[PDB]
Design a protein around this nucleic acid. Structure first.
Lengths: 90, 108, 60, 70
RNA sequence: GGCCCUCGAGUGCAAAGGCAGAAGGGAGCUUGACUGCAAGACCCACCCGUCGAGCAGGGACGAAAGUCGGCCUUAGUGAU
RNA sequence: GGCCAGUGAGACGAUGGGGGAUAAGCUUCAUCGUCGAGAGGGAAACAGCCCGGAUCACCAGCUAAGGCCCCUAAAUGACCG
RNA sequence: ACCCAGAGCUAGCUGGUUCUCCCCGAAAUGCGUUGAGGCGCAGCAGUUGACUGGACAUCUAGGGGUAAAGCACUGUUUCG
RNA sequence: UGACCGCGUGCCUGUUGAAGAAUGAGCCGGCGACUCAUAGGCAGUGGCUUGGUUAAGGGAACCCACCGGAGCCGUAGCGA
RNA sequence: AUCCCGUGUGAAUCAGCAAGGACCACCUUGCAAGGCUAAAUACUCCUGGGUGACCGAUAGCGAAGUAGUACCGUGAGGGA
RNA sequence: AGACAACCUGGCGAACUGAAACAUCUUAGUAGCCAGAGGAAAAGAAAGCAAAAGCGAUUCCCGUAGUAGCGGCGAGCGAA
C-alpha cells in the first residue's frame, strides 16, 4: 500500500501550488486535454499513412479456424492407448 | 516622418544538402559504405571502389580508405584491406576493460 | 496536351484468361512528345507473362 | 466508461506475432509513372513505426497486445 | 588553307561542382526509359528522400574483355 | 530500452559576422562565460564584470579577487622616477 | 426586454491551488503546424532495467578553402 | 526592558529582469480547489502455477461461508 | 436488405404469399394488412421497520424559532 | 371533467457544445413545452431467429465487445 499524492498541499510535500503542471497553457487548465494522437495541426500519423491492404473496405480479417494443437504439446499429457485424442479428452 | 518600407525581392535558398566526405582517409569501411557524396568528380574513383550515378564513391570490399594523388592536379580514392591487426593485453585500454569487467563480476 | 504519358501494351499476351496461370496483359506507361513523333510508338521490351522479349504496341 | 478503440487509427497499425507495431509506407497510390522501379519496391513493404510515435499509437487504441521490448 | 596560346569552347534551361583523345562534337546498330529482387550505407523529430556491390531471368551492343534497370550531377513537385 | 516531467518569451558580456548610421540597455545567427535557478567577498549603491560554488556548529586559523590617511579591517611602509 | 430552464454552456485566456525533511535537477533550441503568448516529436530532467567501456590529458593520420596572402583566372583600377 | 554600534531593498503572483512607483490583500476568525465511477497502460505487493479467474445470479438480507466455469486472459504463426 | 410514412399506381390466396442484408434460382423458416394479456423491470411527494468509518447550527433540506416566512420585484420570479 | 414528487406512453422538438474553425456529422431524439394513464407503463404470443445443426411470445441482468460494422472512413457512433 503506497500512499498516493494528495497534490497541492504545501511546497514541502513537493507537488504544490500549480501541482506539477508548470506554468499556464493548454495542459495546465482544468478539463479534457486534447485529442490523443493529435500532432498539433500537423497531419497526424494515423491520417497520413495508407491502411493495411485488406482492411480498407470489406474483407474480414483472417480469423483463425481449427484450434491448433501440436504433436509436441500432446506428449506432455500422457495416456498409453490414448483413447480418441479429440475435442472431448483434451 | 512615418515613411513606407520597401519590400525585398530576395529571401529564397535550399537547405544545405549534406555533401562531402563521409568516410575519411585511413579509416574503416564496408562492402557498400558511402565514402563521398560529391556534386561532381572532385575526387575520382580508384581501385576496389565503386562509383555511382551521382558520382557517389563507395567501397566494394573491407579495409581502410586511401586518398591517393592522381597525376596532373586531381585526387583518387582507393580501398585497401589490412593484413594483421595485433592486440596486446599489456596496454591501457585492455587493462581497463578487464578491470571494469572484473569489477562488474565482483559486485554481482 | 503537348508531351504526354502513353499506354504501351503488348501485342504479345493479347487478352486471354482461363487455366490458373492466367495470362494477364503486361503494360508500360511512359512519355513521348505528341508533336515530335506523331505516329504511335512500337518499342520492343520484356513481358514477364510471355517470358520472352515482345513488341509492345501503342494504344490511346 | 470502457475505452472505445480509435478505429480511425487502428486500421493503419497492425501488430506482428512477436508484438511490434507495423504500418504501410506512404507515397505509392498515384503519380507512379514518374518514380523509379527501385523506389516503388521500398514503398511496397511494411516496417515498424518509429520509437518516437509509439506513444500516440498505443495511446490511441488500447487493445493491441503490443510489446515495447521488455 | 597555314600558323600560334592550348581547353579561356561546349555541356537543351539558373548557378556551383565537374568533364580530354573526354561527360564535349560526329557516325553504325538499337530500346536496360526491363521483370523478379537486394548485402550494405548516407540523410534525418516523424512523414519523406538518396547511393547501391551482387544474384535470377530474358535481351541490347561488340571480335572479345565488358558496358546498359534513362539522361555529367544537383530543381521539373505533393501525403491521406 | 521501460515508466513518467517541465521546457519550447530568454537576458547580458567576449569573440566571428550579417542588418542598422560598423547609432542603440537595438535586432539576427554562430562559438563560449555568467544570470536565469547562486548566496558570500571586491566593485560607494549596482541580475548579467572580477573572485568563488552556501550540509550544519566554533567569540579559531590561512588565503582569492581587491586593498593598508579618517569615515571603515590592514604600512601617515620602504627605495627610484 | 426581463424571468426560469438547457447549464457546473465553453474560455488553447487571467487569477488561485493549504503540513515537514532528505536526494537528484532542467529549458527558454530545431522541426511542423488557420501556428506564432497553444500543441506535437526531437533536444535537455527524474526514475528503473539492459549493454558495454569511455571521460579528462598528450600524440599521430585524414579531407577541407576560412584568416592571411596573391593578381595566373573572373571583375575592377591608376600611371607610363 | 533596552543607552549606543554594526548589518538588513515587506510578502505573494510573475518575469530576461520586480524594494519596486507592476498585480493582489483594511485587520481577525471560519468556509474555500487534481476528487469519484468505470475502463487502458505501467510499477509495488500478495495468491494460485494440476494454467489462472469467475460475471450475473443464488445466501435465517448487507458483509460472509459455500455454490455458479457462461465468458475472459495465456497455449501458432503467416498472408488482403 | 429488414420496419414505417406523403404523393401516384396497384397484386396473389396456400399449384399461394413473405423472409433468409441488392438481385435470380434452389432449399429452409414463417404466416402480415383484427384485437387482449400477469411476472421478472423503472422510480420516491410518501407510510412502516431497520442500518450508517453520514451532518451537528458558515454543516445537514433553502428552512432545528408560527420559512418559501421577513424582505425585494408591475409581473413571471428571487429569497435571508 | 380537475389535481398528482419521480418513473412511463404518445405529439412537437432546440442550441450552446465536440469536430481544436465549420455547413455533413455530434450535442439528441437530449432539455424544454404539450397531451395521456398506471401502479408500474410499454412491449408480447412469430408473415420471428438460424443454418443444413437447431430454437420456440415478450421484458430485464451477465456476456459476446468496444468485436462485426458505420463514419467530411474525421470527430465520433457501435450491433446481433
Amino acid at each position: 500500500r503506497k500512499k498516493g499524492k494528495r497534490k497541492g498541499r504545501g511546497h514541502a510535500a513537493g507537488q504544490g501550488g500549480s501541482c506539477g503542471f508548470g506554468m499556464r497553457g493548454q495542459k495546465s487548465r482544468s478539463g479534457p486535454g486534447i485529442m490523443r494522437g493529435f500532432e498539433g495541426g500537423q497531419m497526424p500519423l494515423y491520417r497520413r499513412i495508407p491502411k493495411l491492404r485488406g482492411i480498407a473496405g470489406g474483407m474480414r480479417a483472417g480469423l483463425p479456424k481449427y484450434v491448433p494443437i501440436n504433436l509436441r504439446d500432446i506428449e506432455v499429457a500422457g495416456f498409453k492407448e490414448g483413447e480418441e485424442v479429440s475435442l472431448e479428452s483434451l | 516622418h512615418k515613411k513606407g518600407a520597401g519590400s525585398t525581392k530576395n529571401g529564397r535558398d535550399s537547405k544545405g544538402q549534406r555533401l562531402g566526405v563521409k568516410i575519411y582517409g585511413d579509416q574503416v569501411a564496408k562492402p557498400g559504405a558511402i565514402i563521398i557524396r560529391q556534386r561532381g568528380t572532385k575526387f575520382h574513383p580508384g581501385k576496389n571502389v565503386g562509383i555511382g550515378k551521382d558520382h557517389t564513391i563507395f567501397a566494394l570490399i573491407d579495409g581502410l580508405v586511401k586518398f591517393e594523388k592522381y597525376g596532373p592536379d586531381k585526387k583518387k580514392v582507393s580501398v585497401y584491406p589490412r593484413e594483421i591487426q595485433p592486440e596486446n593485453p599489456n596496454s591501457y585500454r585492455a587493462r581497463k576493460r578487464e578491470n571494469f569487467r572484473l569489477q562488474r563480476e565482483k559486485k554481482k | 496536351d503537348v508531351r504526354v504519358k502513353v499506354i504501351l501494351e503488348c501485342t504479345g499476351c493479347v487478352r486471354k484468361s482461363v487455366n490458373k496461370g492466367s495470362r494477364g496483359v503486361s503494360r508500360y506507361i511512359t512519355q513521348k512528345n505528341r508533336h515530335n513523333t506523331p505516329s504511335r510508338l512500337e518499342l520492343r521490351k520484356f513481358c514477364p507473362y510471355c517470358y520472352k522479349h515482345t513488341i509492345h504496341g501503342e494504344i490511346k | 466508461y470502457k475505452m472505445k478503440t480509435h478505429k480511425a487509427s487502428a486500421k493503419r497499425f497492425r501488430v506482428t506475432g512477436k508484438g511490434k507495431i507495423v504500418r504501410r509506407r506512404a507515397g505509392k497510390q498515384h503519380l507512379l509513372a514518374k518514380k523509379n522501379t527501385k523506389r516503388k519496391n521500398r514503398l511496397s513493404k511494411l516496417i515498424q513505426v518509429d520509437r518516437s510515435d509509439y506513444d500516440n499509437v498505443i495511446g490511441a487504441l488500447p487493445y493491441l497486445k503490443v510489446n515495447r521490448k521488455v
